[PDB]
Amino acid sequence: MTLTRDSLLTLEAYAKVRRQEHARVIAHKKRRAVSIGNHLRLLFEDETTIRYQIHEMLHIEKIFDEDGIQAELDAYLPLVPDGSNLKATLQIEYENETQRRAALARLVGIEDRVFLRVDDEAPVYAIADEDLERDTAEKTSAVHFLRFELGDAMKAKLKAGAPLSIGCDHPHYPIQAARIDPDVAASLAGDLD
Amino acid sequence: LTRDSLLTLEAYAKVRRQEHARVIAHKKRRAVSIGNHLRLLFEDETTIRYQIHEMLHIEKIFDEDGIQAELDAYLPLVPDGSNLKATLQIEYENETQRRAALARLVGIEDRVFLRVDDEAPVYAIAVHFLRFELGDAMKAKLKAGAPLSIGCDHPHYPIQAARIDPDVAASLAGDLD
Ligand SMILES: [Cl-]
């Protein structure tokens, strides 16, 4: 997939199905979500997850003009897998403002230290926040957009059902590479061409 | 806000619950919204002292260099006598939408302006914060209770100047020497 303005429901048509969509997409995300320790969450993004977010943004902001719709499509384009990469939203979650505030400082650069490993191939580190200019990218955020680029040997093994593991080697958030749910890895394999 | 004025970890820990309550109350006279997605907090010695103590507490910092570092980090946010200083937050219904908005909002800080009565607007100058430098005429009018308005003329976030609640404006005037 890519998505275009014609891929989207109007505000009226979405509002009619919104509650049903919240449930449909929650169910879908069971095949797309991974936790990394107690405070990091990754959602691997696909047509379903991205279309929903766009619908949600348009609904809440009440956006129905053509340039405004297009601007949300273009804002969410970073999440679209392209054939050779998995895309994920990383969220850092802490119980309170002071805790979160302290964590975000301590965890600076964590979005660059999350890695995947398909079977025994070389690990692949996320490339984060390429949609943000250098200065914006340097400001911390509880939310990052990640890209994991996979080569041919990794694509073959993943589609063949090999184990997929995720880790982090940030000094303040060391997570030993651990196998992802095979049902989730199977869903991810389908994103790749 | 001096070095000798900070509380030890032990002393702050004793007052922390009460201080939270007191600062939440205080921030009600300091916070201003610009449209639906921008939230400013006008900083003063009360909000900045609270922030320092919170970070010393949470990270358990009791070494001199570390304590002095936290102070150095926040001391720039304390108004200097002829100025107002605010921290800006961008806020959406959830955090993923906020992140999806950030690229469009680049440069928003430079486009936030205040206007004291019918004086010229003052644009913010870009721990990040917004610094609004007031001229003597503006300082006097504000102190004397004139209207204070705030807006934004960023191309992705055009918000017409709106008057700030008079109780908040009164608090801000007290920052001025
Ligand atoms: Cl002050």
Automatic annotation (TrEMBL), chain B:
Record-linked InterPro entries: DUF3501
Domain of life the protein comes from: Bacteria
UniProt protein name: DUF3501 family protein
Origin species: Burkholderia pseudomallei (strain K96243)
